[PDB]
A = this chain, B = another copy of it.
Amino acid sequence: NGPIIMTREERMKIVHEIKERILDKYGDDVKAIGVYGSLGRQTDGPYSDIEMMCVMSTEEAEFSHEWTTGEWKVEVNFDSEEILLDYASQVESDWPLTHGQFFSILPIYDSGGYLEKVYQTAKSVEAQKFHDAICALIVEELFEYAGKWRNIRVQGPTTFLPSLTVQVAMAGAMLIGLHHRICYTTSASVLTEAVKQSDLPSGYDHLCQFVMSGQLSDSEKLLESLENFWNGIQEWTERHGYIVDVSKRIPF
């Protein structure tokens, strides 16, 4: 029947049942249990899934249980303190999408201030890591997407252009999120929050309008808008000092 509507009180009842199950099963190996995501922020919608995190004392612990009841869905991640802290301090290309977890933790069980430590680690990441992540995103994603749509212009298929344009808009949102060091609230709010930030690359707002309105059938206009955004990227990185090394033909 798919996911059903639930109240925040019903979801918190489920969360506390899962907390008791975790403590019953894993005992003294549990350091902390938290709720994150929309429920952690107390902004869960009628149909939201449930996301929980556990900090384990066991070295190298890294597993998860993710299931449905037919009516709702739960994901519980189990990590050692060291593994969780390392993950909280790594800035990947999709950091603005993934690390909102650490700014939305609602502690429900904690034997020693562990979840507060995780939050402090996540918020204290040095500026250089975002600089590195931005330069990596330009090479690994945006430059690659530019080749993809330039291939489409000369040989098709234009049937990929709507999906690719969605992917380019999301990559630009990651670029903006890394620059401003902000984690988007939900996947649904990524594009709306991205285009409200200051110092956007030129052409990004215009590109996102096609994506947000769903008007992705004019292939020529999309290709022109993608090229305009790609040009805006170049000027923007120059403005903010996100300079990619292009000097080495083989960098090893």
Identical subunits present: 2
Let me know if A143 and B2 touch, CB within 8 A: yes
Which of A98-106, A126-134, A162-170 sits within the interface? A162-170
Interface size classification for chain A: 35 or more
CB distance from A94 to the nearest CB of B (A): 14
User: Is residue A81 contacting chain B, with contact meaning CB distance below 8 A?
Assistant: no
A111 at the interface (CB under 8 A from B): no
| Complex Cα gap A212–B159 (Å) | 4
Please tell me if A157 contacts chain B, counting CB pairs below 8 Å. Answer: yes
Chain A: residues with CB nearer than 8 A to chain B?
2-3, 5, 14, 17-18, 21, 25, 45-49, 65-70, 73, 75, 136, 139-140, 143-144, 146-148, 150-152, 154-155, 157, 159-164, 166-167, 169-170, 187-192, 211-219, 222, 230, 244-252
* Pair B69/A249 contact, Cβ less than 8 Å: yes
Chain B residues, Cβ within 8 Å of A211:
162-163
Give every chain B residue within 8 A of A189 (Cβ-Cβ). 157, 160
